[PDB]
């Protein structure tokens, strides 16, 4: 019997597993895939790292920040330079130092406030129960899309507002409870957090990618601490602790953090099962739904033409992308994503026409020279049986206020962690990682 | 290695078993339970059958009628004599023949157009591919309650639909998309098919409950054909089989028909997983949200004072209720269900507890003579591990045109049944019958 079980090998749970370990309590990570890191993963390809999950930390995660100091992970700087493309519709492509400066300076103006009336909703979500927001009702009974259209911005303003939210939660407008949009705001710190480079998520990447930051974090923890390739298939408890099932047998611990999303928390074989609140709650937490790409060339030839590599194209399959060559420079990366039904459409059709779509929306915007690929590497994070959706979960209307209050509480002897579990940058990194700590310090004060 | 393993033995799995067998082909049903029935379930209490399940059948609803005729179950009505009593808020408890006629002509005017314009709406939903709606995209994007807001009709009757709404859906209007709501209205064949006692879908009931009916049903197949107390755990498939993997072992087959709801269905662990869209759609048709309760009277004592024993309170706990005393005309019984948010909150209490919720509001509107209880009996479905709520799932905004269409697409070896798969009278017992008809069709098709 070990003191702790950990569900799960993601930042969520290796943080858990290491803080009950340096508190000197027994832990035992079981980890389904043959890898730490989960939703992050880094492949090496064309000699330098792919990052097929999550790369980027920004300056108002300090969770992350402070992980990756203390592991030893140098940063590198998200190109900012150079003009951005905006496509509209069937329109020329044009060209500007800033995406701003594409659209009129009412347009400007009216995403702007857009943005600012969304922050004064957002500010009155509490980050540890949205559910306890004065307008809770009406605000979980609303989709972020009826909100967007009472605002009456222009048509070009709420096209440009649905690219970002489709780049930001992987769901489109109508998928999200005004409350879920809500809180995700205020959780990151505003709008302007969650879409821009400098002073935002995307500022920064990890030199050697993300997923070694994980390897390193999971070296904190001795020898057969951690299982992988260990899928857990169950978890029983009663009065003296729980038990683990997995293919290979059985593991008895004292108490579990489950670290898995949400979707997959609720597969496990739980005996007692699990409440009606909280299995109804993941009923309720669908993954969203995003298609990652990494489109590689001999060198980045945009930059020579004065282009930063960002398209914005909200008409498009593809929204948003990003120059995503490493800093020796060589060879040119332009990263992306296909978001929501563009993903689900995109998920079903093969690597080629995949690549094929991508490549066509870069020749419209960065020039033809984008159809001369060396490389297309992608991942269809559906697709992944141990995640089942990027970035995160969401909440259509109706799910906060009702079933939400399940989503931290322990049941019995099982406690929860994950990035959806998370008050602030809850779906990022950072989040997973706050999760871990505070799963961590809640199983360590119930040992007794 | 048999021909078909069919996974579930509710009305689903059990009319696809009967259809192989009949055309000759070997059959295994796997039922996780010690009982079939699956979402109809019957016990005996106070010398009656007590339905804590599926209970009703209707007009139109022609498979389950021709299959109680076949196998020897007698139908019997549904009281639909004496006043139903409503009550709004902290009113006077309204008597009156109809619940119709407690609303002004106005009021029962906007009503109907309301259920009028739903209907118009349902009609040019297709039954095989709501998705494929003309306006599918628009109509993905509402939920019923947007839509509801939209007509412009007065405020207490949008309450008097919402009561309506969550009855017949075990779920808000701020859940469901308009789609799925406009779907599942044009399976009934109409808002009257949904809601109406006497030429409605609560117009009959089966003497000696639901469950004898599917034992008579299970009872065509072979001995050693079904097996209980069987959870299926995995699902495997190759080139040449289908391989189900229990605690106990495996069972090999040519082609399985996989016959539950789909939140569990997403549960078993499937080999090769399933495709993103599926497993996708699986996460966006969560199970509603009901308690079903039964009030045991030694008398329907209502009767006397030409009280029907329905009660229609918008602002209590609990939806309408209905005389369910059997045709020997004792014990009296008010059969009602606690539905939606009001199901969640009260899954969380004691059956005590809600015993006296229910007799606190039936006091109200019946009267002091509701207090004299001789039994409460009830069912919370989000609690029952192999059903995880009733009646059946429901699809918010988005999931119906981007997920929607795996739902019935076979997966190699890997057919699909159960209610939520029917083109006609989803959600309900008759619905489950034709996806196992449907199922076995594809199936024997397959083999042959
Ligand atoms: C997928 C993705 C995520 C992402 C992103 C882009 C994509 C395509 N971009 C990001 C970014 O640039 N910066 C950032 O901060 N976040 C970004 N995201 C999100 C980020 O990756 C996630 O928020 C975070 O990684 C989540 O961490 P968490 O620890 O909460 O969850 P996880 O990584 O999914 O790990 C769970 C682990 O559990 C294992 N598993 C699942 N089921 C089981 C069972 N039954 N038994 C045992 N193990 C199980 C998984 O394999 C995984 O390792
Ligand atoms: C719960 C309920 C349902 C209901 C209703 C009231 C309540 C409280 N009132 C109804 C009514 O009056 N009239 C009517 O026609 N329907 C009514 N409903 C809905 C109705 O009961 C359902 O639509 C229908 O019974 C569904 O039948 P179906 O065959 O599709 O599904 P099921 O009954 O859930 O059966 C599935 C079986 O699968 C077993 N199971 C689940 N998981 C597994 C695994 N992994 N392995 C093996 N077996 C599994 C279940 O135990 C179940 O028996
Ligand atoms: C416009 C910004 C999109 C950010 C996508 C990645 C989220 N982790
Ligand atoms: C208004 C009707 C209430 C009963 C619904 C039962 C659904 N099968
Ligand atoms: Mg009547």
Redesign the interface.
Same mark, same amino acid.
């Not at 979980?140 to 989709?143: C, E, L, N, V």
């Given at each position: 019997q070990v003191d702790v079980v950990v569900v799960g090998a993601g930042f969520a749970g290796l943080t858990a597993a290491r803080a009950v370990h340096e508190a000197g309590r027994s832990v035992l990570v079981l980890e389904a895939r043959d890898r730490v890191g989960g939703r992050t993963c880094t492949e090496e390809h064309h000699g330098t790292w792919i990052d097929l999950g999550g790369q980027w930390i920004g300056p108002g995660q300090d969770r992350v920040a402070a992980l990756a100091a203390e592991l030893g992970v140098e940063t590198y700087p998200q190109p900012t330079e150079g003009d951005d493309v905006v496509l509209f519709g069937d329109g020329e492509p044009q060209r500007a130092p800033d995406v701003a400066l594409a659209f009129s300076d009412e347009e400007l103006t009216a995403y702007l406030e857009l943005a600012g009336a969304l922050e004064a909703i957002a500010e009155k979500v509490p980050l540890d129960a949205p559910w306890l927001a004065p307008e809770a009702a009406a605000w979980?009974?609303?989709?972020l899309?009826?909100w967007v259209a009472g605002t009456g911005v222009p048509d070009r303003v709420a096209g440009l507002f649905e690219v970002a939210v489709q780049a930001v939660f992987a769901?489109?407008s109508?998928?999200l409870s005004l409350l879920h949009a809500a809180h995700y705001v205020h959780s990151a710190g505003g709008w302007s957090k969650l879409t821009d480079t400098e002073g935002g998520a995307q500022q920064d990447r990890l030199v050697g990618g993300v997923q070694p930051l994980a390897e390193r974090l999971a070296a904190r923890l001795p020898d057969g601490a951690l299982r992988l390739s260990t899928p857990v298939?169950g978890l029983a408890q009663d009065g003296d602790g729980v038990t683990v099932r997995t293919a290979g047998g059985e593991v008895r611990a004292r108490r579990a953090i489950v670290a898995v999303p949400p979707?997959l928390a609720? #597969?496990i074989?739980h005996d007692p099962?699990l %409440? +009606?609140?909280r299995?109804?709650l993941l009923?309720?937490m669908?993954?969203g739904?995003v298609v990652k790409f990494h489109v590689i060339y001999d060198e980045p030839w945009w930059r020579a033409e004065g282009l930063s590599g960002t398209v914005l194209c909200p008409d498009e399959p593809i929204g948003v992308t990003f120059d995503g060559t490493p800093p020796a420079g060589t060879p040119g990366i332009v990263t992306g994503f296909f978001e929501?039904?563009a993903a689900?459409a995109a998920?079903?059709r093969t690597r080629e026409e995949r690549r094929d779509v991508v490549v066509d929306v870069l020749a419209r915007t960065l020039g033809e020279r984008a159809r001369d690929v060396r490389d297309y590497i992608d991942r269809?994070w559906?697709?992944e049986?141990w995640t #089942?959706?990027c970035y995160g979960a969401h909440l %259509? +209307?109706?799910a906060w206020?009702?079933?939400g209050p399940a989503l931290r509480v322990p049941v019995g002897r099982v406690h929860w962690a994950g990035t959806e579990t998370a008050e602030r940058w809850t779906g990022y990194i950072d989040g997973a990682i706050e999760s871990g700590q505070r799963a961590a310090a809640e199983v360590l004060a119930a040992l007794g």
């Open positions: 979980d009974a609303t989709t899309r009826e769901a489109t109508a998928q298939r979707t609720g #597969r074989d099962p %409440p +009606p609140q299995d109804q009923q309720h669908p993954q739904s929501g039904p689900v998920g079903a269809d559906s697709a049986p #089942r959706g %259509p +209307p109706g206020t009702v079933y």
